[PDB]
Design a protein around this ligand. Structure first.
Ligand code: NDG
Ligand code: NDG
Ligand code: NDG
Ligand code: NDG
Ligand code: NDG
Length: 235
């Protein structure tokens, strides 16, 4: 059930709405304002597959159901689940089953998310990757459980590492040979459609399946202008 709404932070404000389906749709003019300010200094701001919003701010991490209207004081009701060290991460993201993945100091870690202030998450997390993980530009999951990654200007996908003895990049399938480093945002919707913002323009299409598929030549243009101004843009 339910396709998730697109969300984004633009000029310190938080908006939500169904994603735009053509370049004549002025998304910002119709989107619901779900936060009046305070959103631009989060380092990370993302949603779990269970619908909980996670935010990293000033080295601490907070969670709560997302705000539904502009006067919902999200940070006043969010639960603080981390008191320090959350700005050390380069990436912080969920797999489809609710496990949190994190890249810190070139290593990849995985575990169920912290549920309280006193939980030393980084200490109990499993190290599933020992080196190479700060070299990616993007690292994100498809809803089918495959890990997608942009390395240099190349694009790859493969089931995630089973342990730190698993050399992921060596067995990954290459699904793109160039141009992937020029995107500002690159992410999946909840039904597996790939969405990307490249120089102000917003595109969507089924993801490439092999290195010679010219994704940008076939993708649908769903937005022209303003998308490079967002600080966060995600489903
Ligand atoms: C980061 C955060 O929770 N910001 C909210 C803001 O969006 C909302 O408009 C306001 C309502 O009083 O409370 C907070 O400031
Ligand atoms: C990144 C990480 O796991 N930081 C945790 C922090 O959230 C927590 O409050 C503390 C409790 O001892 O341990 C850690 O440092
Ligand atoms: C990016 C990548 O695939 N890194 C892996 C690393 O996680 C793993 O510990 C090692 C095993 O020899 O191989 C690679 O370096
Ligand atoms: C961003 C993008 O779509 N890059 C693709 C690239 O992956 C592919 O190898 C090439 C083949 O023609 O076309 C494009 O450039
Ligand atoms: C961020 C945003 O909503 N940008 C839209 C843009 O995609 C669209 O092409 C244009 C149509 O007039 O309006 C806006 O600028």
């Amino acid at each position: 059930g339910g396709e998730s709404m697109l969300r984004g932070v633009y000029q310190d404000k938080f908006y939500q709405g169904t994603y735009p389906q053509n370049k004549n749709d002025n998304w910002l003019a119709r989107a619901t304002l779900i936060g009046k300010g305070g959103w631009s200094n989060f380092k990370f701001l993302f949603l779990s597959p269970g619908g909980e919003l996670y935010g990293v701010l000033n080295d601490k991490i907070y969670k709560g159901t997302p705000p539904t209207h502009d006067n919902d004081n999200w940070m006043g009701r969010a639960k603080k689940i981390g008191n320090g060290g959350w700005n050390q991460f380069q990436f912080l993201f969920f797999d489809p089953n609710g496990y949190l993945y994190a890249v810190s100091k070139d290593k990849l870690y995985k575990a169920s998310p912290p549920q309280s202030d006193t939980d030393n998450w980084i200490a109990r997390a499993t190290e599933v990757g020992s080196g190479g993980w700060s070299g990616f530009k993007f690292l994100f999951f498809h809803p089918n459980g495959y890990l997608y990654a942009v390395h240099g200007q190349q694009f790859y996908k493969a089931l995630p590492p089973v342990s730190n003895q698993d050399n992921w990049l060596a067995r990954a399938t290459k699904i793109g040979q160039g141009g992937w480093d020029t995107f500002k945002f690159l992410f999946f919707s909840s039904v597996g459609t790939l969405f990307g913002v490249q120089g102000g323009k917003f595109y969507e299409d089924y993801p490439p399946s092999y290195a010679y598929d010219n994704w940008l030549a076939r993708a649908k243009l769903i937005g022209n202008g303003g998308w490079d101004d967002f600080r966060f843009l995600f489903f």
